[PDB]
């Protein structure tokens, strides 16, 4: 078939700090009818905005980190499992995870532990307390933010050999795929008996009942590993059902899967030496490092910004990636690199953030 999706640029603004914006996320936890909110991170700032009619972007609150040398690279939304209150986790160059109350912009709690910069944060899709961080220290870490424990460290003997740049949970939250500067993509199952038990123990941990500190799992071995997809750093990975989307600097997002064509993802052996490349979503002028692609909630659209301010969009319901391409979103004033984009939960709005601190709003026609 062909793509039908059309957008219109309705507004733009520039943050006064003039520093690159690396991350943008709409809050997908807000209930139907409630206002559409998104956060941006860059420099030592976290900024919240609300989307209103006629393309209005309303500034809500600004968070300025006490450390002027901090560079936030990522953010992720969650909610407090008890009070239903929204929460925002942010991290970057210092390698500290800060949990912010978005209503007040106060740092509620922080987590130190990574040896270096945190490149990405992801919350578990079923459990709001399970936070994953990926780092320049070559490891991923799984945190339980209800008990303030480090559940597991994914790294070591057969872990990444260079910075981990990205990771994603699958839809049901049974596994994680990570990727990084060592050109590899690695699978880490979290539905194993070992990991399910480690998660259960992180919840049983009561500090005002024991003097011993919590013991984290050290997961040295992934459930699948490949260096056969890309020929350089892998800076973005996402699950597409049982398939994987990943990118390097080759001006393509590759769709692939572990094993041979018919192999079940849940029957893949840790020693599996084969991969199957299923297709490529081709684009141009996105050969610089650290550019993320995004999908909408329903995984019907794929978006990626390039180094010159173009925003590519594909329809994932069209089998051939070449016939899946939608009209590239361009504005003559949008000329800086688009680091990340985010769709609103209903896919009605697409926000793009840039290296020149600009924010771009595209409404779905």
């Amino acid at each position: 078939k062909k793509c039908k999706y059309s957008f219109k640029c309705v507004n733009s603004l520039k943050e006064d700090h003039n520093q690159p914006l690396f991350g943008v996320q709409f809050n997908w936890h807000s209930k139907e009818g409630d206002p559409l909110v998104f956060a941006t991170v860059g420099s030592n700032r976290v900024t919240l905005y609300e989307c209103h009619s006629q393309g209005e972007i309303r500034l809500l609150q600004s968070y300025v980190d006490a450390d002027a040398d901090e560079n936030f690279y990522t953010c992720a939304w969650t909610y407090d499992s008890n009070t239903s209150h929204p929460l925002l986790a942010v991290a970057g160059s210092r390698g500290i995870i800060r949990i912010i109350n978005p209503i007040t912009m106060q740092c509620i709690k922080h987590y130190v532990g990574h040896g270096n910069a945190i490149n990405e944060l992801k919350f578990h899709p079923r459990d709001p307390n399970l936070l994953l961080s990926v780092s320049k220290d070559h490891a991923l870490r799984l945190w339980n933010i209800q008990t303030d424990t480090l559940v597991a460290i994914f790294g070591g003997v057969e872990g990444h050999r260079d910075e981990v740049l990205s990771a994603d949970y699958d839809l049901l939250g049974e596994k994680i795929m990570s990727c990084g500067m060592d050109h590899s993509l690695k699978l880490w199952r979290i539905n194993s008996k070992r990991m399910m038990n480690a998660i259960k123990e992180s919840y049983d941990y009561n500090p005002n009942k024991t003097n011993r500190p919590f013991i984290s799992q050290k997961i040295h071995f992934p459930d699948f590993s490949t260096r056969d997809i890309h020929r350089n750093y892998v800076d973005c990975v996402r699950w597409l059902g049982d398939l994987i989307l990943s990118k390097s600097c080759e001006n393509a997002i590759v769709c692939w899967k572990p094993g041979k064509m018919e192999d079940d993802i849940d029957k893949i052996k840790p020693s599996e030496s084969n991969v199957t490349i299923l297709g490529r979503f081709d684009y141009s002028q996105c050969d610089i490092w650290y550019m993320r692609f995004s999908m909408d909630f329903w995984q019907k659209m794929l978006a990626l910004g390039n180094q010159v301010g173009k925003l590519y969009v594909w329809d994932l319901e069209v089998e051939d990636p070449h016939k899946a391409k939608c009209t590239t979103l361009t504005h003559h004033k949008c000329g800086a690199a688009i680091r990340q984009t985010s769709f609103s939960r209903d896919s009605s709005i697409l926000i793009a953030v840039c290296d020149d601190a600009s924010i771009w709003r595209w409404d779905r026609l």
Binding site: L172, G241, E317
Partner: peptide, 29 residues
Amino acid sequence: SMFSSNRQKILERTEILNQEWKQRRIQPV
């Protein structure tokens, strides 16, 4: 096809997540 089987898996799994979101009442920001 591998395509239709994969889209169906996305459809059923996103539905499970959407039903969990629907039962939640997260306070606005």
